[PDB]
Design a protein around this nucleic acid. Structure first.
Ligand SMILES: Nc1ncnc2c1ncn2[C@@H]1O[C@H](COP(=O)(O)OP(=O)(O)OP(=O)(O)O)[C@@H](O)[C@H]1O
Lengths: 591, 663
DNA sequence: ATCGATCGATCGATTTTTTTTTTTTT
DNA sequence: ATCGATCGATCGAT
């Protein structure tokens, strides 16, 4: 090997010796690796490094890694593993480096790429799609020669091997190694890596005016594998690999399939998240107030007048409603689903955009829709190596998240029947060709629909006004009709805010709620029951002479509603005080 | 050669461990002599083939090679890493330590072992006048060997290989590893015997040829390799002798994830596994099991230069299986807790669906179809049901779908279904291409699957026509008719039938007359013996008390009280067929009386005449069933005496099925 | 010694493939 | 990757 390789390794001594912060971090890995060794008789070898130090270290070695990482990297690979030996050599292996950056040039999105940006480690970000599923891949092989014994040994290198190009050496597989003895395949002594490959589309948000997005591939190996689900927003960083022939490989047009390899691919929220102390204390401070919730309500409609009762239901839906599953019996549905309805220009779909942002999971829907929505729709045939692979639709892809529906009334009933399976059953069922499974979709959901006919959504009865009979009505825990009714007293209020439109903090909310989600579930208290039992019964005792439908499922929501406010209060226990809130919005549900 | 394919040292060595293997093989203490002695003769006794091994006992003898020295390197830590070297080399010592006779082979017994001695009869006589090839140790085995790993109380000894895992929990480093994962079975394509070594025969020069074959394929030898035909101008002809060559039974299955292990996103992972030996036929599709086995890749064929890199893609092999949820003698007494309790017709009636409140009278009739009977044989012959078809009419849902959830669960041949849901093609044998193994094999279900058992049904109005006609014929019962394709068959459906269906939109209107509210065809309702109208009017007293039960849970997991003790299904079910063996014979006393109330019902139902409450006409089919009802009701009394109250008891349920339309 | 046929080393060619958006009929 | 045919030479026959 050239000293150019040995010197670069030698050039990496003082670094990361300075900054030495990674030195013990790997040792922090060493210990935890040793830690698990203590209990059983898990951490990946690869380590994070801020590239920045090269700017205080070698600017030539700096940009070179940005230039020819293929060269500078491999020596940096050794010293890490090399020092890793020296770090702990006592007890008796890629050890990769990520580099958050410290960017960039080399900062580009996938839509705009190369030819110059090729063969260079670069940050690229976007949707994870469609994310080819993982398969296992060997490198090293080993054997036993009987009856003479000993042990055989074999190594492998593919096209995607390491970083740089190397001579291709498909070996078939080692057998009958001289002397000519039978060689039985040996495993677990031999080396393996599960392989993964995924493309990534550039963001439609950052997408240009009139053109379609182009998703580009990246390999996923070892820990890099399965770090993320498909459809995620994430920034990949690594060298761009051009490997493969231009049709010249066989003497006889388009050419050179290409993708980026490694490295970090930091998940990006645009969840996660850091909390700390100062921040959560605001939660801890704000939690004391019972006056906070309306503030929680008012923050929801920066551009929106009122409908705060409609708003209150939204956050209560953010809570999740405290899923409680029967022991060796079926769970009752935990989460709440609603549909906005009313005369045109309601800004109901507008509201979904608000539901669309801080929500963080998940995908919305406008009318049609399908085939299948969250259905995999049987991704087929094969793809790949003859292997049938289903790819979950949005409804599945949205699991443990929000579902917004625009033009829900216009949607085909074909998949509506599935939405019964989607909502009441709250799980996915699949038989097509095919794979046979029932997979959980517990996703929280909401929809929106116009009046069946015209502006008469007021005058005409709400039944026949549903536009989507029947059990569809039973499904949704709340249906709010939006009257387009106008008032000069109203319009006067309507103007200036619409006027101020053209010319308590929101982000703090989702952090307040997200932590409010895992901590802490209020469970149940009979005291809330005591009033509500007389409530819902009385609701069937009166409302049936007023409106409908009225079902115990609506009562089941009461537990959901109060369950949410108990979260809104951050109460460790349910209170009957919350019911008055739920019942009232339920009062508003009727009126 | 040196360099390429370098010989590489490892601290692990089995050279003396193989001796340490035979130290453990045979000789043993904890379980007169060691368990491995007469048990290995037990295989030499040929009453057993499968050899079962566990990691549990290895630890104690490893403790026996430990404490209790002299000290020796651990086998078990070299096992889970490879262990395939242990499926042979540890096992290859068995010919050294196995007893010779060990008893008489007789005749049959079986073939093979009479031939295999003849193969060795021909093999030894080859060298008898010859004065030196011999049948390899792998060539003659006749016994399978299995491993069952330790979880376990040994792991807390303290002592890993047994920790249950998801497919998602499956690392690439676990290749070669004997491992254990919990998962749902899938596929389970049929098992077939697979040969390890072909037996060719030279004819002319004779002898025997054995060529190893691995994985999915092999390259068959030709000509003659026999040395008698070697160097002689004439090479003998040869082709595989199937009687001679050894076979191995090969099954396989996909294993789905439990779905609780799954991430909130992504997808359930099916896992290909291949069943072999005595371990075959140990599983069915969709069963949940903690699977324990070694995991090895099986490349390639190809392709080849396609893959590259190789990217093994591997698979799992099944070492061992642990399944989840695996007279009229002395079980009559298990019937006798409620036998001494009496109230068989009620307490059990109250025993039905303790989870849902009230409507015990509805549950009261539920007990009948859960039993039914008993049919008839006219000798004409035309057999008559024999079976109860019940419908449930009311909306909104009322949680009516839940009644079917309890009923089918308890019921043998329990099948839950819904309008869409299973089609009429789902209730018939329907041709479909079978993935992997081919081809176009028919798979029936539903009605065909639910025959000789209850079928619960929902969305019964949305089953449309294609289903209606089938079940229309399923009311003709005891048949499923397909004239489709080249298939002319009509197959017996003994299915018990119950479907609850929703009234015309939005909900039922009391002003609406009967049969105008119903979405089902009249001829479809006429062959129905019973329908329970589920119309729900709010009752503040009842609303509270039910809400109270809706308060009582979620409050606790245990609902029933103040007071009752619902029978568990297993002990409850045992009385079902036990009662179904009865076949009560009708007393003529109640016999003519049922006729009397019939012409009364043939009178009063017709005197209702036009529209309104209805339904007429009180056809004999209902009386034909109502007679069967007391015949089904008598079964709970057993005794086959058919009491008149037993008869009239059904007549009480007849009017009750209706007349609630006044409410 | 001319001719041959014979075997072998030479040469080079062949290895996957059907499902989700449709559309004229009452 | 293996199988397939071309084609080259060589050792026997006449
Ligand atoms: N509460 C409100 N606050 C501010 N603007 C509102 C409100 N309600 C309605 N609007 C106005 O009405 C219009 C609604 O248009 P938008 O496309 O959002 O309707 P939508 O939600 O799709 O309703 P639909 O589904 O009936 O079309 C917007 O221009 C919006 O400014």
């Amino acid at each position: 090997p050239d000293a150019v390789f040995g010197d670069r390794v030698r050039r990496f001594q003082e670094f990361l010796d300075t900054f030495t912060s990674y030195r013990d971090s790997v040792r922090s890995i060493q210990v935890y690796n040793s830690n698990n060794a203590a209990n059983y008789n898990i951490l990946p070898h690869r380590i994070i490094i801020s590239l920045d130090d090269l700017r205080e270290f070698d600017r030539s070695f700096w940009s070179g890694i940005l230039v020819e990482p293929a060269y500078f990297i491999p020596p940096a690979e050794k010293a890490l593993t090399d020092l890793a030996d020296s770090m702990d050599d006592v007890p008796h292996h890629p050890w990769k480096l990520s580099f958050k950056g410290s960017f960039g040039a080399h900062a580009l999105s996938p839509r705009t790429l190369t030819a110059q940006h090729l063969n260079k480690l670069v940050s690229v970000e976007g949707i994870v799609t469609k994310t080819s599923l993982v398969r296992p891949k060997l490198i090293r092989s080993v054997h036993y020669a009987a009856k003479t014994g000993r042990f055989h040994y074999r190594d492998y290198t593919d096209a995607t091997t390491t970083l740089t190009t190397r001579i291709p050496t498909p070996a078939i597989y080692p057998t009958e190694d001289t002397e000519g003895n039978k060689l039985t395949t040996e495993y677990g002594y031999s080396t393996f890596i599960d392989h993964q490959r995924i493309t990534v589309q550039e963001m439609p948000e950052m997408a240009p005016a009139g053109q379609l997005p182009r998703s580009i591939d990246v390999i996923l190996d070892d820990d890099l594998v399965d770090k993320t689900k498909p459809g995620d927003r994430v920034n990949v960083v690594g060298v761009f690999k051009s490997l493969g022939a231009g049709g010249m490989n066989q003497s006889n047009l388009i050419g050179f399939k290409t993708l980026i390899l490694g490295n970090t691919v930091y998940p990006l929220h645009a969840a996660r998240q850091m909390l700390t102390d100062f921040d959560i204390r605001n939660i801890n401070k704000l939690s004391k107030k019972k006056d906070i919730f309306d503030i929680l309500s008012q923050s929801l409609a920066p551009s929106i007048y009122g409908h705060d009762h409609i708003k209150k239901a939204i956050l209560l839906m953010l809570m999740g409603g405290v899923e409680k599953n029967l022991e060796n019996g079926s769970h009752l549905r935990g989460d709440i689903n609603i549909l906005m309805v009313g005369d045109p220009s309601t800004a109901k779909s507008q509201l979904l955009r608000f539901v669309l942002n801080t929500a963080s999971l998940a995908i919305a829907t406008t009318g049609r829709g399908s085939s299948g929505v969250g259905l995999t729709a049987a991704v087929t045939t094969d793809r790949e190596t003859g292997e049938r692979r289903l790819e979950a639709g949005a409804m599945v892809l949205a699991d443990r998240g929000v579902v917004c529906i625009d033009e829900f009334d216009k949607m085909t009933d074909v998949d509506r029947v599935a939405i019964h399976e989607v909502m009441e059953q709250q799980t996915v069922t699949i038989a097509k060709a095919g794979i046979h499974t029932t997979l959980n979709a517990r996703c929280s959901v909401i929809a929106a629909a116009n009046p069946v006919f015209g502006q008469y959504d007021v005058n005409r009865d709400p039944h026949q006004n549903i536009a989507l009979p029947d059990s569809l009505l039973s499904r949704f825990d709340l249906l709010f009709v939006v009257t387009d009714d106008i008032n000069e007293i109203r319009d006067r209020s309507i103007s200036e805010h619409v006027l101020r439109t053209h010319r308590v903090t929101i982000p703090f909310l989702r952090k307040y709620v997200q932590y409010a989600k895992e901590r802490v579930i209020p469970q149940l208290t009979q005291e809330a029951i005591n009033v509500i039992v007389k409530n819902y019964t009385d609701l069937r005792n009166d409302d049936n002479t007023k409106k409908s439908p009225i079902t115990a499922r609506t009562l089941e929501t009461l537990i959901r509603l109060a369950t949410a406010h108990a979260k809104v209060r951050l109460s460790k226990t349910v209170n009957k005080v919350d019911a008055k809130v739920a019942a009232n919005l339920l009062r508003f549900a009727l009126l | 050669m040196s360099a390429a394919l370098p010989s590489i040292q490892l601290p692990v060595d089995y050279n003396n461990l193989f001796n340490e293997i035979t130290d453990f093989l045979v000789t043993f203490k904890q379980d007169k002599g060691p368990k491995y002695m007469a048990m290995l003769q037990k295989v030499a006794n040929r009453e057993l083939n499968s050899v079962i091994i566990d990691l549990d006992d290895i630890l104690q003898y490893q403790n026996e090679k430990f404490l209790q020295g002299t000290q020796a390197d651990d086998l078990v830590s070299a096992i889970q890493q490879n262990a395939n070297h242990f499926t042979e080399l540890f096992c290859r010592a068995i010919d050294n330590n196995m007893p010779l006779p060990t008893k008489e082979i007789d005749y049959k017994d079986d073939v093979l072992d009479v031939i295999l001695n003849q193969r060795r009869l021909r093999n030894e006589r080859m060298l008898s006048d010859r004065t030196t090839e011999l049948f390899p140790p792998n060539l003659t085995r006749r016994y399978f060997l299995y491993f069952k790993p330790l979880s376990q109380n040994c792991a807390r000894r303290y002592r890993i290989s047994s920790k249950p895992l998801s497919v998602r929990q499956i690392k690439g480093d676990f290749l070669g590893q004997l491992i254990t994962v919990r998962g749902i079975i899938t596929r389970v394509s049929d098992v077939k015997p697979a040969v390890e070594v072909i037996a060719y025969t030279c004819d002319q020069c004779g002898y025997e040829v054995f060529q190893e074959v691995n994985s999915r394929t092999f390259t068959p030898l030709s000509e003659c390799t026999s040395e008698e035909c070697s160097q002689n101008q004439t090479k003998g002809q040869l082709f595989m002798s199937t009687r001679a060559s050894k076979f191995s039974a090969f099954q396989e299955c996909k294993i789905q994830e439990l779905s609780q292990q799954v991430p909130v996103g992504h997808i359930p992972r099916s896992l290909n596994i291949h069943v072999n030996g005595t371990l075959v036929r140990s599983l069915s599709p969709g069963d949940i099991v903690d699977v324990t086995g070694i995991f090895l890749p099986a490349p390639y064929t190809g392709f080849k230069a396609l893959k590259a890199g190789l990217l093994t893609e591997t698979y799992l092999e099944a070492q061992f299986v642990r399944q989840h949820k695996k007279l009229t003698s002395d079980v009559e007494e298990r019937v006798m807790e409620l036998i001494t309790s009496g109230d068989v017709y009620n307490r059990l009636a109250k025993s039905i669906a303790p989870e849902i409140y009230g409507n015990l009278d509805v549950k009261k009739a539920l007990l009948l179809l859960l039993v039914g009977g008993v049919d008839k044989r006219v000798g004409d012959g035309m057999k008559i049901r024999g079976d109860i078809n019940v419908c449930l009419m009311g909306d909104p849902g009322v949680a009516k779908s839940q009644l079917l959830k309890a009923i089918c669960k308890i019921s043998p041949r329990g099948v839950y279904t819904t309008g869409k849901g299973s089609s009429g093609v789902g209730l018939t044998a329907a041709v479909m291409k079978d993935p992997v193994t081919d081809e176009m094999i028919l798979e029936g279900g539903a009605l065909v699957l639910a025959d000789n058992g209850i079928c619960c049904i929902d969305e019964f109005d949305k089953m449309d026509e294609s289903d209606r006609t089938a079940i229309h014929e399923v009311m003709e019962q005891q048949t499923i008719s397909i004239s489709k394709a080249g298939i002319n068959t009509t197959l017996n459906a003994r299915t018990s039938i119950l479907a609850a269906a929703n009234p015309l939109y939005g909900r039922y209107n009391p002003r609406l007359s009967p049969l105008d509210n119903i979405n089902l065809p009249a001829a479809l309702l006429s062959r129905f013996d019973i329908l329970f109208l589920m119309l729900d009017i709010p009752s503040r007293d009842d609303d509270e008390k039910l809400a109270e039960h809706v308060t009582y849970v979620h409050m606790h997991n245990k609902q029933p009280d103040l007071d009752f003790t619902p029978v568990e299904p297993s002990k409850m079910r045992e009385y079902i067929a036990y009662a179904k063996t009865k076949r009560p014979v009708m007393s003529e006393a109640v016999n003519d009386y049922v006729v009397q109330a019939y012409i009364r019902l043939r009178q009063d139902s017709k005197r209702e005449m036009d529209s309104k409450f209805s339904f007429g006409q009180a056809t004999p089919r209902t009386l034909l069933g109502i007679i069967r009802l007391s015949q089904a009701l008598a079964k709970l009394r057993l005794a086959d005496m058919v009491d008149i109250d037993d008869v009239e008891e059904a007549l009480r349920l007849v009017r009750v099925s209706k007349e609630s339309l006044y409410q």
